[PDB]
């Protein structure tokens, strides 16, 4: 977020000199990115002292909000809204049997915040026509993750969900978030834009052919990003 404001103007000036009729091409203002409600990515008591069968409902409901980048009540989303890395602070006490499985579910939250910030910054007009459609089509894969999360919260309110069921439900979505997060970090890191982020999507699709859970993702991402090309 903070670092991107430089990158935008430099990459705009290159492609503005290249074209001979690019006229009245607008840019999105910065406070669309700054505020944590125009983007998809954002009392509290020590959870250890409660009974066993209440801490479960507690940390599951809190974790379901943590997946999309915001505090539940007892596990907090640390405020950065900057780079391709985000950290979360779980409370230093919990029942061990719940606590190990919570730690195993926790990477998909850091593998959502980094995806969503890349989706915010590179749907603009300074990273090339294919990268805009790419971030706009990774936005759809984040929309399905959000739909999953809404259904899980609904079932958890009516007493039909636990951390074992939550762990079983999020595994394909954990794979989808891992692939998109690695891709977002890689495209940001090498300052890739345009067609160099239409080649990486081709390589990743060839890599996975032993799963068919990630292969279909990569095929769909390549199909959607090459529609302006």
């Amino acid at each position: 977020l903070q670092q991107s404001l430089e990158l935008k103007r430099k990459m705009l000036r290159d492609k503005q000199n290249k074209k001979n009729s690019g006229q009245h091409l607008p840019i999105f203002p910065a406070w669309v990115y700054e505020r944590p409600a125009l983007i998809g990515d954002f009392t509290a008591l020590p959870i250890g002292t409660l009974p066993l069968a209440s801490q479960e409902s507690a940390v599951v409901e809190d974790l379901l909000y943590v997946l999309v980048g915001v505090d539940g009540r007892y596990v907090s989303a640390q405020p950065l809204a900057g780079r391709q890395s985000r950290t979360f602070l779980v409370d230093p006490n919990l029942d061990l049997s719940i606590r190990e499985l919570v730690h195993r579910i926790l990477p998909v939250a850091a593998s959502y915040s980094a995806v969503t910030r890349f989706i915010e910054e590179k749907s603009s007009f300074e990273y090339g026509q294919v990268n805009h459609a790419l971030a706009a089509a990774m936005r759809t894969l984040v929309k399905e993750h959000l739909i999953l999360v809404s259904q899980l919260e609904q079932l958890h309110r009516q007493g039909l969900l636990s951390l074992q069921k939550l762990w079983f439900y999020i595994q394909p979505a954990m794979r989808t978030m891992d692939i998109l997060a690695s891709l977002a970090t890689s495209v940001d890191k090498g300052e890739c834009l345009g067609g160099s982020t239409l080649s990486l999507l081709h390589d990743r699709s060839f890599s996975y052919t032993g799963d068919s859970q990630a292969q279909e993702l990569c095929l769909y991402l390549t199909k959607a990003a090459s529609a302006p090309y």
Partner: protein
């Protein structure tokens, strides 16, 4: 306080008319609430901010 009051308040911050147990104290960011009860608001109050925007 019971849950039904919170239901009635959240149903008004979608209209842009402030509640009682949930109020807008800052206008730059979303509504702030004045245990499962509290956790819904961290997603729901943003929608009141955007509707007012």
């Amino acid at each position: 306080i019971t849950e039904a009051a919170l239901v009635r308040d959240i149903l008004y911050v979608f209209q842009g008319i402030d509640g009682k147990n949930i109020k807008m104290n800052n206008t730059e960011n979303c509504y702030k609430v004045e245990r499962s009860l509290r956790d819904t608001a961290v997603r729901l109050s943003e929608l009141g901010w955007l509707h007012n925007k």
